[PDB]
Design a protein around this ligand. Structure first.
Ligand SMILES: [Zn+2]
Length: 646
């Protein structure tokens, strides 16, 4: 094809035909090609660290001996269920309810989901504090709607026959002896899911923020010993003096059920919380039978995952920064990190220029948009400081002890955040997750070193396509802070509106033309279908603005990178033209013909042949670069174009 007629078919015409989607894939994209390379290059890194033999105390030893304790499943059979019985004896030695709570927190430090979930995030009202959050997790089933809903009555009918068969595999004997205890478990989890919140109530952040003092928590949940619980977690009541109860009416009844239900019913319940947590880290009788309820009955999986697929997922859950640090000493070196800091600084300079020369917004709110970009951070690459795993011992011949110690060095790290203030470069995803977004509550882009891989950012090639590639994905995500979506968020992340009515109306009337452009677009594969499929242009309006504001800034940020010099021409291609060829190669994505019709109904992005082609029609720099005449398919008239920044 011709790039003035079809920019997408010029560089992906040799990819949309002669590349077939594999059978397990729904859609095979360039965003999904990085998922297959961040799961290969992490799996090839922990396999290499197991066959290396580093010194005891380093981090190539610690990931190398945790994965090799999982992959040697013959030594888990030699251990038996005897590592579980030493940890079940902590439940069985508990006479009163005080020692049952302190045994439960020692399980909860070591990786067992207890009765109250614990995570430590920021305050999000103060944001100079780290606070601890007391969620709901007291049930063995994934939702509240597996106990009362009539659709999920097949699961609760098959629930106590699974717990009786798992208790029979631990203590020995037949399932008729343990059907009495497994009916006491479901009768307590039904009483715990009576006070679970719904899914549509849990996302509402007005009732999901209830700041309590620790002296107020003991008077609220009277019937639980909270002091010996958090001491066994690895903290103190003078170390979490204020805390947020995420579900406050759940915590009143759960501590009321801790003192009203008999403690033998709670101890067989707490045995089951230990058994189904440690079920993938035990023998093949307990690995396979726990899959038959949790993968075959619930999710519907025909075969269990392999030992290496759960081996990498054990290392990634326990030590994500240790596998993060070795991913970026091989695949994202500091010459490629220092290359990408200039590119975001040029993108932050092009957003400083284009806001100041802007016409469609108020000059009182134009200075508000410069105050947000001065408060703008960018978590790009890897963190500036790693997390210390030096308090962690990993033995190669003990899989159950490593999971007890790897979950305890993660739980001691997040509960040590309560002493110091907020780092604000904490990096809640590791640098191998392919998830690049914009977080408006704290105002940054989070672009890890897996999205900064080719064909998005090749650091050895010419610098033109890195502005067209990851430099326009970044300007899409910086542009989500200055759109109609980002009008509700200021530079600190609070919910104040820095757009006036005039700005909203002008921005709406400028971007009114994109709805009539995108309503008349049909994917080339779905053109043959008898019922014409049309991109719902009023539904995909928020992402079509941001792809337009992403590319139009990265052409300016390329122009302030050359610093007056002409662009280098490689194989007859201008550097202004090579931004658009790097824009048209980050949407190497095809779908199946059945899934793409479902993509036009519910997916708020456009089809990926119209994120590329339907954005360069409205960019004035596309017409000068490719010499687009009047008789071309992407030739818009210049009065109907949408311009957001230039
Ligand atoms: Zn996106």
């Amino acid at each position: 094809a011709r790039p003035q007629d079809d920019l997408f078919g010029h560089v992906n015409g040799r990819w949309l035909a002669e590349h077939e989607i594999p059978a397990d894939r729904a859609t095979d994209g360039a965003f999904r090609s990085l998922f297959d390379r961040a799961e290969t290059q992490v799996r090839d890194l922990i396999i290499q660290a197991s066959q290396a033999g580093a010194a005891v105390g380093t981090d190539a030893q610690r990931i190398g001996d945790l994965y090799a304790s999982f992959l040697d499943e013959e030594a888990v059979e030699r251990a038996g269920v005897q590592p579980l019985h030493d940890e079940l004896a902590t439940i069985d030695s508990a006479a009163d309810a005080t020692e049952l709570a302190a045994a439960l927190g020692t399980l909860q430090r070591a990786g067992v989901g207890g009765g109250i979930g614990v995570y430590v995030d920021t305050d999000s009202k103060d944001s100079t504090r780290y606070l601890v959050h007391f969620t709901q997790s007291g049930i063995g089933l994934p939702d509240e709607s597996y106990y009362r809903d009539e659709q999920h009555a097949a699961v609760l009918a098959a629930y106590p026959g699974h717990i009786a068969r798992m208790f029979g595999l631990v203590y020995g004997g037949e399932s008729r002896d343990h059907a009495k205890t497994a009916d006491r478990i479901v009768a307590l989890e039904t009483k715990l899911a009576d006070a679970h919140w719904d899914v549509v109530k849990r996302r509402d952040a007005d009732l999901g923020y209830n700041l309590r003092t620790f002296a107020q928590l003991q008077t609220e949940g009277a019937g639980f010993d909270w002091v010996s619980w958090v001491t066994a977690l690895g903290s103190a009541p003078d170390a979490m003096t204020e805390l947020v109860v995420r579900q406050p009416d759940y915590l009143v009844t759960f501590a009321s059920l801790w003192a009203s239900v008999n403690v033998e019913d709670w101890k067989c319940w707490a045995r089951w919380r230990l058994i189904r947590a440690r079920a993938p880290w035990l023998t093949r009788a307990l690995v396979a039978e726990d899959f038959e309820f949790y993968g075959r009955t619930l999710t519907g999986a025909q075969q269990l995952r392999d030992r290496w697929k759960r081996g990498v997922s054990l290392v990634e859950n326990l030590m994500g920064d240790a596998v993060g640090k070795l991913y970026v000493q091989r695949h994202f070196p500091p010459d490629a990190k220092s290359r990408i800091d200039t590119l975001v600084d040029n993108l932050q300079e092009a957003y400083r220029i284009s806001i100041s020369e802007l016409d469609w917004m108020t000059p009182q709110t134009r200075q508000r948009a410069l105050a947000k970009l001065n408060k703008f951070t960018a978590k790009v690459g890897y963190p500036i400081k790693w997390r210390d795993y030096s308090k962690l011992a990993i033995d190669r011949d003990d899989l159950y002890g490593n999971v007890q110690r790897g979950y305890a060095v993660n739980h001691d790290r997040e509960l040590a955040k309560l002493f110091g203030p907020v780092d604000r470069d904490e990096w809640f995803m590791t640098p191998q997750t392919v998830n690049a977004y914009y977080n408006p509550g704290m105002n940054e882009i989070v672009f890890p070193a897996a999205i900064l891989q080719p064909p998005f950012f090749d650091p050895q090639a010419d610098e033109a396509a890195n502005y067209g590639g990851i430099g326009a994905v970044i300007g899409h995500e910086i542009g989500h802070g200055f759109d109609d979506q980002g009008a509700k968020y200021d530079g600190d992340g609070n919910l104040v509106d820095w757009w006036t009515d005039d700005d909203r109306t002008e921005f709406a009337a400028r971007t009114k033309a994109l709805i009539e452009q995108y309503h008349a677009y049909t994917p080339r594969d779905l053109v043959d279908h008898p019922g014409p499929p049309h991109v719902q242009g009023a539904f995909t309006i928020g992402e079509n603005i941001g792809d337009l504001g992403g590319l139009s800034i990265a052409l300016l940020a390329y122009q302030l990178s050359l610093n007056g010099n002409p662009a280098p021409v490689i194989d007859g291609l201008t550097g202004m033209q090579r931004v658009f060829f790097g824009w048209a190669q980050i949407w190497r994505t095809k779908s199946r013909a059945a899934e793409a019709i479902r993509r036009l109904a519910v997916d708020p992005h456009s089809p990926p042949e119209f994120r590329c082609n339907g954005v360069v029609r409205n960019v004035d720099a596309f017409y000068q670069a490719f010499d687009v005449t009047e008789d071309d398919a992407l030739f818009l008239d210049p009065q109907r174009r949408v311009r957001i920044w230039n």
